[PDB]
Enzyme design. Structure first.
Site, PDB file in Angstrom:
ATOM      1  N   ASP A  16       0.813  -1.163   0.062  1.00 52.86           N
ATOM      2  CA  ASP A  16       0.101   0.146  -0.106  1.00 52.86           C
ATOM      3  C   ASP A  16       0.752   1.204  -0.250  1.00 52.86           C
ATOM      4  OD1 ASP A  16       1.030  -0.124   2.617  1.00 52.86           O
ATOM      5  OD2 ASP A  16      -0.919   0.254   3.525  1.00 52.86           O
TER       6      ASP A  16
HETATM    7  P1  LIG Z   1      -2.560   4.298   1.268  1.00 53.79           P
HETATM    8  O1  LIG Z   1      -3.105   5.374   0.210  1.00 53.79           O
HETATM    9  O2  LIG Z   1      -3.007   2.995   0.738  1.00 53.79           O
HETATM   10  O3  LIG Z   1      -3.217   4.784   2.890  1.00 53.79           O
HETATM   11  C1  LIG Z   1      -4.750   4.764   2.621  1.00 53.79           C
HETATM   12  C2  LIG Z   1      -5.308   4.521   4.115  1.00 53.79           C
HETATM   13  C3  LIG Z   1      -4.264   4.541   4.973  1.00 53.79           C
HETATM   14  C4  LIG Z   1      -5.498   2.973   4.023  1.00 53.79           C
HETATM   15  C5  LIG Z   1      -6.725   5.137   4.313  1.00 53.79           C
HETATM   16  O4  LIG Z   1      -7.653   4.750   3.294  1.00 53.79           O
HETATM   17  C6  LIG Z   1      -7.351   5.079   5.626  1.00 53.79           C
HETATM   18  O5  LIG Z   1      -7.478   3.839   5.950  1.00 53.79           O
HETATM   19  N1  LIG Z   1      -6.899   6.160   6.699  1.00 53.79           N
HETATM   20  C7  LIG Z   1      -6.542   7.236   6.509  1.00 53.79           C
HETATM   21  C8  LIG Z   1      -5.927   7.998   7.685  1.00 53.79           C
HETATM   22  C9  LIG Z   1      -6.331   7.358   9.018  1.00 53.79           C
HETATM   23  O6  LIG Z   1      -7.202   6.471   9.004  1.00 53.79           O
HETATM   24  N2  LIG Z   1      -5.906   8.103  10.236  1.00 53.79           N
HETATM   25  C10 LIG Z   1      -5.095   9.222  10.341  1.00 53.79           C
HETATM   26  C11 LIG Z   1      -3.885   8.827  11.022  1.00 53.79           C
HETATM   27  S1  LIG Z   1      -3.118  10.369  11.895  1.00 53.79           S
HETATM   28  C12 LIG Z   1      -2.038   9.873  12.857  1.00 53.79           C
HETATM   29  O7  LIG Z   1      -1.195   9.092  12.967  1.00 53.79           O
HETATM   30  C13 LIG Z   1      -1.781  10.590  14.125  1.00 53.79           C
HETATM   31  C14 LIG Z   1      -0.089  10.743  14.613  1.00 53.79           C
HETATM   32  C15 LIG Z   1      -0.058  10.704  16.230  1.00 53.79           C
HETATM   33  C16 LIG Z   1       1.225  10.105  16.454  1.00 53.79           C
HETATM   34  C17 LIG Z   1       1.337   9.060  17.818  1.00 53.79           C
HETATM   35  C18 LIG Z   1       2.827   8.256  17.487  1.00 53.79           C
HETATM   36  C19 LIG Z   1       3.406   7.972  19.210  1.00 53.79           C
HETATM   37  C20 LIG Z   1       4.677   8.011  18.929  1.00 53.79           C
HETATM   38  C21 LIG Z   1       5.253   8.049  20.351  1.00 53.79           C
END
Ligand SMILES: *P(=O)(O)OCC(C)(C)[C@@H](O)C(=O)NCCC(=O)NCCSC(=O)CCCCCCCCC
Ligand SMILES: [Mg+2]
Lengths: 69, 87, 79, 126, 221, 103, 115
Positions: free
Chosen positions: C38
């Site tokens: 992906d």
């Molecule tokens: P690609 O194009 O194949 O991806 C598409 C995907 C990811 C499959 C999307 O369709 C999907 O399913 N979701 C899109 C994004 C989502 O679900 N959530 C957003 C994530 S934001 C995030 O990660 C916040 C960051 C916090 C950091 C915490 C880390 C702790 C470290 C100590």
């Protein structure tokens, strides 16, 4: 559904950049943690939780509340 | 009430030389504008602490140097001192 | 610089990856169908190659990379 | 000097898996360096705590107050609070139960915190 | 030309020797020439910045509405109340405590009552204030604005019977929370002679002159 | 009913009674109270009972600003009525030693 | 402040502390000589038919100067060994648990806000 898929990938790569630039922490655990977090966060389909998580990721990237080094 | 009572183990935090005022720690028996008899502490744990104290008393007339306006303690934060920042 | 050096370094760094199955690792190895990767995984591949070979790879062209042949061509014509 | 570099160096010999260190800004009004360390066993946690406190006592700073081991009876979790650095030894299960990294990186933007209502007050009935 | 004297400079009536007041005022002025204490009244929004002794001396800030100014001399205190995370908090700050780094008047106002202690029983909206609110500009040589807000109270019982004449509260809409029978019954505790008892009034005009003379002499020195 | 109900608490006895009714699969209470369907949330069942027989009590709750008096369904009265109905037997025959007799 | 048969408000997100009937647990024992609980004291609660140790974080009774006064008597559940039952605290809590001697680092770490 999200703010931008390109924005999501840019946030992820910037988090990887910060992990590489970090000194005290551990690369293995940092990368495993961020990868697991993204894997569990993706595929939610509601997109409101995902825009909230995009905002929270922007806040984490800025690190004005707390920075891990 | 209305009997003589004594409080022991009270220290001096500040002395005003111009107005002849002692800032004793804690509370002392008696009402305001009453006469209280003060002397050195009799407690055994504080005996032999008068080596640096004036003996037999202080004599301003024969003193070589003039005392400061207010004699503070090492722990006392003076009113003119800046805001205290802890570590 | 050696062109076969770029080629085999890219091949070696792609072999170094763990989750992907090193079955058909050619220049035209389609990540999406041959390996089932992906966007997150392909960006991970971009990072895994950049950490040891790169420092000038932007996302605006890395997002459409899709193949080690593109990797080698981009490295060669950037250097 | 006893600093965060000293702490990480003393945890390296201590075999400290997953050393997470977070710099707490003066806004949060808690400390300077917050450290989370995962050990293999409760005995490992106790040994790491003993070694770090022994090194702190033996190194320098005769003036500043001593530090007590916090959580001796707690096998899963242990804590030490120095003058400006706080260290928490905890097993991976306890870390998963209480994930502190997101809490201390995102103030009020944490997952659990979002899942918990900020404040609610019951009203009357019909 | 309005010249404001801080309340703690006016001592309580009693038999205390004036020398103690003089020395306490000297210490107050010496502390004030280091820390600027702004002019504010009950109901004014204040942001106080202090230092935390057991948090490695870190700087801390707290914003709230002043609901009570009590104490005298070096012991003068003021209570700041706010609603944080849907939870009321009150802190009794000491003006002359060296811990206080600074005091800022976010919004200078005056209320219909001497003390706002009934805000505890009033609705949370009338005590909830934004922590990061921008201070509002005050025009120089302008009368202090008076806020005629009439808050709405929660249903009884309250912390205290605020309707009784002893409190003498005028910032409460009693007509929206009490009945006329309750008001008439509470009227039974009125003391019409108390306001006309002229032997319990305290004269401070002959003292404020000396206080101002001492303050101005210290400032010149 | 051999012991005093208040010494244990009406809520837990109501929860245990609902649990036993669900385990015995009789479901007399739903048709007795006109309830929607078989449920196991004791608080929801008691709220439905209080709605059915019109009981409201005012109680103090602990909020962030202080104590607040609110009118809520009379859960103790609903539990007491449920227990009284069961003891009178309008909810059907019951066996509380079924599991221990089975083994 | 808090003593026997005194209603308290549970401030963490513990499932045991979550009351569906909006009923408040009340303390049945205070682990102090005089039985009066101030900030940082440890008490026992009879909550949901269970006896659970709890740590008081804020109380309505006034205290020393510069110390915050809360409009409700707040408490956080603790286990028999010291590990908090809940995971996070939303309402601000005093920082004086640092100064006070006891097992408080876990609660301070899981806390969000300070006053
Ligand atoms: P690609 O194009 O194949 O991806 C598409 C995907 C990811 C499959 C999307 O369709 C999907 O399913 N979701 C899109 C994004 C989502 O679900 N959530 C957003 C994530 S934001 C995030 O990660 C916040 C960051 C916090 C950091 C915490 C880390 C702790 C470290 C100590
Ligand atoms: Mg009262």
């Amino acid at each position: 559904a999200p703010w931008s898929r390109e924005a999501v990938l840019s946030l992820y790569r910037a988090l990887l950049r910060q992990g590489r630039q970090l000194r005290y922490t551990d690369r293995d655990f940092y990368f495993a943690s961020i990868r697991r977090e993204f894997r569990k966060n993706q595929k939610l389909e509601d997109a409101e939780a995902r825009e909230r998580q995009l905002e929270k990721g922007l806040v984490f990237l800025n690190g004005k509340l707390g920075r891990i080094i | 009430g209305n009997i003589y009572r004594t409080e022991y183990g009270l220290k001096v935090w500040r002395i005003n030389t111009k107005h002849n005022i002692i800032y004793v720690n804690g509370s002392v028996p008696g009402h305001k504008n009453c006469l209280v008899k003060v002397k050195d502490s009799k407690l055994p744990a504080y005996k032999d602490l008068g080596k640096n104290l004036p003996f037999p008393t202080y004599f301003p007339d024969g003193d070589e140097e003039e005392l400061p306006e207010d004699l503070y303690d090492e722990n006392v934060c003076q009113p003119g001192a800046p805001s205290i920042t802890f570590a | 610089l050696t062109l076969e050096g770029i080629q085999d370094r890219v091949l070696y760094v792609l072999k170094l990856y763990d989750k992907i199955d090193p079955e058909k690792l050619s220049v035209n190895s389609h990540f999406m169908k041959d390996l089932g990767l992906d966007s997150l995984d392909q960006v991970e591949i971009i990072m895994a190659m950049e950490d040891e070979f790169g420092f000038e790879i932007p996302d605006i062209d890395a997002e459409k990379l899709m193949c080690p042949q593109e990797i080698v061509d981009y490295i060669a014509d950037k250097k | 000097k006893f600093d965060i570099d000293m702490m990480v160096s003393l945890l390296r010999q201590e075999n400290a898996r997953d050393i997470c260190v977070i710099q707490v800004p003066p806004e949060m009004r808690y400390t300077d360096y917050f450290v989370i360390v995962s050990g293999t066993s409760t005995r490992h946690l106790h040994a790491m705590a003993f070694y770090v406190v022994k090194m702190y006592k033996h190194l320098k700073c005769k003036r500043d107050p001593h530090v007590k081991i916090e959580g001796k009876d707690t096998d899963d979790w242990l804590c030490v609070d120095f003058g400006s650095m706080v260290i928490h030894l905890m097993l991976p299960e306890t870390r998963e139960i209480y994930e502190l990294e997101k809490l201390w990186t995102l103030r009020s933007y944490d997952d659990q915190l979002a899942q918990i209502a900020p404040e609610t007050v019951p009203e009357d009935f019909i | 030309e309005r010249r404001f004297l801080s309340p703690e400079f006016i001592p309580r009536r009693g038999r205390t020797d004036p020398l103690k007041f003089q020395i306490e005022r000297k210490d107050m002025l010496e502390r004030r020439k280091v820390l600027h204490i702004p002019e504010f009244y009950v109901g004014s929004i204040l942001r106080v910045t202090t230092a935390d002794p057991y948090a490695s001396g870190k700087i801390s800030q707290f914003l709230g509405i002043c609901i009570q100014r009590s104490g005298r001399g070096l012991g003068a205190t003021f209570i700041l109340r706010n609603v944080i995370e849907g939870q009321g908090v009150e802190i009794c700050f000491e003006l002359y405590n060296p811990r206080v780094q600074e005091i800022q008047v976010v919004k200078l106002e005056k209320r219909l009552d001497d003390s706002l202690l009934y805000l505890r029983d009033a609705l949370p909206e009338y005590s909830t204030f934004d922590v990061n609110m921008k201070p509002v500009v005050q025009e120089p040589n302008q009368k202090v604005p008076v806020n005629e807000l009439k808050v709405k109270m929660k249903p009884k019982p309250w912390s205290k019977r605020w309707e009784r004449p002893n409190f003498n509260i005028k910032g409460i809409r009693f007509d929206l929370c009490l009945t006329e029978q309750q008001m008439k019954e509470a009227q039974k505790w009125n003391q019409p002679w108390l306001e006309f008892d002229m032997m319990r009034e305290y004269d401070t005009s002959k003292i404020e002159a000396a206080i101002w003379k001492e303050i101005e002499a210290s400032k010149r020195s | 009913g051999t012991v005093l109900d208040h010494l244990v608490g009406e809520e837990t006895m109501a929860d245990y009674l609902l649990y036993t009714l669900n385990k015995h699969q009789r479901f007399g209470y739903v048709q007795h109270y006109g309830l929607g369907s078989a449920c196991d949330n004791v608080e929801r069942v008691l709220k439905s009972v209080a709605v059915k027989l019109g009981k409201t009590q005012k109680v103090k709750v602990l909020t962030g600003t202080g104590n607040v008096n609110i009118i809520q369904p009379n859960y103790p009265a609903a539990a007491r009525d449920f227990l009284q109905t069961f003891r009178r037997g309008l909810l059907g025959s019951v066996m509380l030693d079924l599991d221990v007799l089975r083994g | 402040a808090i003593q026997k048969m005194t209603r308290v408000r549970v401030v963490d997100n513990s499932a045991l502390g979550n009351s569906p009937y909006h009923r408040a647990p009340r303390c049945i024992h205070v682990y102090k000589k005089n039985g009066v609980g101030k900030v940082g004291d440890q008490i026992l609660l009879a909550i949901k038919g269970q006896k659970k140790k709890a740590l008081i974080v804020g109380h309505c009774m006034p205290g020393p100067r510069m110390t915050p006064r809360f409009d409700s008597n707040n408490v956080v559940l603790i286990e028999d060994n010291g590990n908090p039952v809940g995971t996070r605290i939303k309402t601000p809590i005093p920082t004086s648990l640092r100064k006070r001697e006891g097992e408080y680092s876990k609660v301070l770490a899981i806390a969000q806000n300070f006053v």
